[PDB]
Symmetry: D3
Subunit: 69 residues, 6 copies
């Protein structure tokens, strides 16, 4: 599928924290940056994610805030 | 403040699209990646954002989905 | 791409209201249900959406509340 | 209460997966579609939800993305 | 309707900024605190919101971040 | 950091329910209102949250719905 979400950042899975109904996936997206994603365990299983998998961090623009020092 | 949001990514403002009550800020966070943020125009003014400003893209972990190739 | 979002509902575009930076797309997903989506105008153009387009309403499970009478 | 959320879709609870502080509720909203919801266990209990309960999937318009096949 | 959203804060409408497809509603919830809401212009009209209207700010718990000083 | 989030509500922590990857923090912001926040356990620990902590409820404007009687 092609998605409206303005942010679709390729990266490699660095870690997966398995929980009860959710888990947290950490992706290395390059440039020294990592992104953490809290999603359903069903989705982690259905996408076959494991440490080392290639994936994307997907974020709708209305979910992104801006901060300054 | 220090925020619980797991994602706080430093970058430089590449463009700002001004709208009616919202605008869209694009940040270059390095590594060839950019992040687009849709926030209120009031916040854009109050934070003093301009093209070239140093800023952060801040994203709660529960807002991030994972994708894989087809 | 394939997405973790638990909700990916097929439907056809019934209307698009254009704004300044955002627009509102209404999708008929059948069975008398319609979904309204508020997204960037850039995405609306990039996905080539028009009245009648086939599309999907995509919703992260953590964005769905449950209500009762 | 009347809510601003543009999406308020009636359906029946088909399943509830209990987690630690959250659970996942699945609603059959008709037309062969289901909606899955991740909400607090406290709310699942307070709303008295069970398999067979009548409910609504409530989604703010700004939370809905659009996808296409792109073929 | 009854909603699972764990946050439902009564207040009075102090201001409405109209936009193109969205507007921004500000509620006085008391104690010197205000809540700003970015919602569709359709909802603002359909709910009959005006300066002075009694209303509620409704927020899903997964939408709330926690911050601290320093 | 300074954040674009239009809602930054001072309060004191009255409860913490720990989960597997998330926990739920309840902040009393005065006037008889309490705000519940579902965030990662990592964040709860990293912010040093305990009953009695001074903190802020931070909410993006696009996450706030309006309801009426």
């Amino acid at each position: 599928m092609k998605l409206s979400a303005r942010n679709q950042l390729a990266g490699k899975v660095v870690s997966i924290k398995e929980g009860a109904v959710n888990g947290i996936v950490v992706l290395d997206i390059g440039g020294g940056n990592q992104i953490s994603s809290t999603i359903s365990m069903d989705s982690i299983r259905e996408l076959g994610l494991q440490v080392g998998s290639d994936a994307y961090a997907v974020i709708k623009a209305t979910s992104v805030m801006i901060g300054i020092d």
